[PDB]
Ligand binder design. Structure first.
Ligand SMILES: Nc1ncnc2c1ncn2[C@@H]1O[C@H](COP(=O)(O)OP(=O)(O)OP(=O)(O)OP(=O)(O)OP(=O)(O)OC[C@H]2O[C@@H](n3cnc4c(N)ncnc43)[C@H](O)[C@@H]2O)[C@@H](O)[C@H]1O
Ligand SMILES: [Mg+2]
Ligand SMILES: [Zn+2]
Length: 214
């Protein structure tokens, strides 16, 4: 299965991706995670991405396409993959078609997880992440059992740099501008599948399972 997860910032893509890889054993390819890892390596690519990410802007198309092309070329993507947060512009979507054509592959589904803007703001500002294992919580919808600490080790929880209200506002504006173009692109292809992301995490996943069952 060759899959894209699409959704506005905070819509639950990582949450659902983790459940998809656990069930189906395909690799999770998240451009955001890749940029954050590059930032940690301290690479020139990483540091250039950081300037956009800190402002809630999209990293420019050409560099983003390049890391995706390289990642999809690996042996672990031969039997399927899960792209998460790529593509983010129509130019990226067109590039992906070319990347896949070169590999002799086709997208099966673009799974678009729909949540309203006001809810997404709170998804992000209420997000807390474990410093020591990267487990994700939400102060309202998925709280840790003990305030301020991770359930699975005892690690301190932190707030992603870009989850501050100012940056979240810009993230939402930037990606909302790109949304109708992307939706139309994939509707034309007949591969867009919309999922109601305003449900219990497991009910979202149940809807995705029903789709992937076909
Ligand atoms: N292709 C590209 N081109 C250019 N630039 C790019 C790029 N890709 C990345 N970038 C750059 O990198 C930056 C970051 O990328 P971005 O795509 O923002 O990073 P991300 O971590 O992949 O995605 P989000 O942080 O938006 O969250 P999510 O949808 O994964 O939600 P989550 O499951 O964590 O859940 C969020 C919260 O909600 C909670 N939650 C999840 N599901 C539910 C539910 N069903 N009900 C209630 N709460 C829930 C969680 O507990 C959590 O607290 C971009 O701004 C840009 O600069
Ligand atoms: Mg994510
Ligand atoms: Zn932890």
């Amino acid at each position: 299965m060759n899959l894209v997860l699409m959704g506005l910032p905070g819509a639950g893509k990582g949450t659902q991706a983790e459940k998809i890889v656990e069930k189906y054993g395909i690799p999770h390819i998240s451009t955001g995670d890749m940029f954050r890892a590059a930032i940690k390596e301290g690479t020139e690519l990483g540091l250039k991405a950081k300037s956009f990410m800190d402002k809630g802007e999209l990293v420019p198309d050409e560099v983003t396409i390049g890391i995706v092309r390289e990642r999809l070329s690996k042996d672990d993507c031969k039997k399927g993959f899960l792209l998460d947060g790529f593509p983010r512009t129509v130019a990226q979507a067109e590039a992906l078609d070319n990347i896949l054509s070169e590999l002799g592959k086709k997208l099966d589904y673009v799974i678009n997880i729909e949540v309203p803007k006001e809810e997404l703001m709170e998804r992000l500002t209420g997000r807390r992440i474990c410093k020591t294992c990267g487990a994700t919580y939400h102060l309202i919808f998925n709280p840790p059992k003990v305030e301020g600490i991770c359930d699975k080790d005892g690690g301190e929880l932190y707030q992603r740099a870009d989850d501050n209200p100012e940056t979240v506002a810009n993230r939402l504006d930037v990606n909302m501008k790109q949304t109708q173009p992307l939706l139309d692109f994939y509707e034309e292809k007949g591969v867009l599948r919309n999922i109601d992301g305003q449900q219990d995490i497991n009910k979202v996943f149940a809807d995705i399972k029903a789709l992937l069952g076909g």
